[PDB]
Design a protein around this ligand. Structure first.
Ligand SMILES: Cc1ccc2oc(C#Cc3cccc(CNCCN4CCN(Cc5cccc(C#Cc6oc7ccc(C)cc7c6CC(=O)O)c5)CC4)c3)c(CC(=O)O)c2c1
Lengths: 137, 139
């Protein structure tokens, strides 16, 4: 799954966290969003950094946004319904383990992303996605 | 070596664009932005790439308490002086110029310019492929 991703939302402290998972590696990026333009922005930034070819979502929210459709078209990203899981739950453990170390939840979110991608034994999620993309190239 | 980065500022439209360059590849990340803002940008970068040394060539970043709690937290060394980013800024700005009317917010135009810069080929890999080849090789 070189450029296959999936995009979910989770919630903490009355806020929305947008979570992209690189399916084959477990690598993740996340960001605190309001609910539209900011998902399109998130997607464009992801696509500039990694190969992003197919993004799966499991509801209709993302199919009803003209800015998200514009970003998909601009960057060549194909939006796909249906799931190609527990990191919303694994991410939230880590956020909690670290929440007291930052004022802003969003900082705690990015701390948890860091720990998730860097840990793990053999290869970590961050090393996997790079291994997966290196071989492919 | 794979974890060397250069950090600088540039400006368009009354706004500040923070730019990180992966020195060995030319790969770039940017954002419109300070103190906490740069700390956040750094923490996110380091979560995604190996970030071991960040070079800057001015004093601003050495005066931010938050920037450097982030340095400590993520294990990033902040050195003064350059080990590419100013001709980079002139490139980033040309591309921003070509797309500026394709988005409402400068933030978006900036990120489209990042995408183009990282995805295009100088045949022979793009910046995005080189930073990955460089990091793959290292393991
Ligand atoms: C075709 C196409 C394609 C793509 C497109 O996209 C868009 C579109 C959009 C659109 C709109 C609005 C907004 C947006 C972006 N919004 C997100 C931008 N970010 C900026 C910065 N902000 C971060 C922040 C803020 C405040 C404080 C901190 C902090 C901190 C901190 O870090 C730490 C690290 C370590 C430690 C120890 C400590 C710390 C600490 C301190 C502590 O916490 O203790 C960080 C967050 C937000 C985007 C369009 C539409 C168009 O344009 O046409 C479009 C079209």
């Amino acid at each position: 799954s070189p450029g296959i991703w999936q995009l979910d939302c989770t919630h903490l402290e009355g806020k929305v966290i947008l979570v992209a998972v690189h399916v084959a590696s477990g690598y993740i990026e996340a960001e605190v969003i309001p609910a539209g333009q900011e998902t399109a922005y998130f997607l464009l930034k992801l696509a500039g950094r990694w190969p992003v070819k197919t993004v799966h979502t499991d509801n209709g929210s993302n199919f009803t946004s003209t800015t998200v459709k514009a970003a998909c078209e601009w960057a060549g990203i194909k939006q796909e319904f249906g799931i190609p899981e527990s990191m919303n739950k694994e991410l939230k453990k880590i956020i909690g383990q670290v929440r007291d170390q930052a004022e802003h939840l969003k900082t705690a979110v990015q701390m948890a992303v860091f720990i998730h991608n860097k840990k793990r034994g053999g290869y970590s999620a961050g090393e996997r996605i790079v291994d997966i993309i290196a071989t492919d190239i």
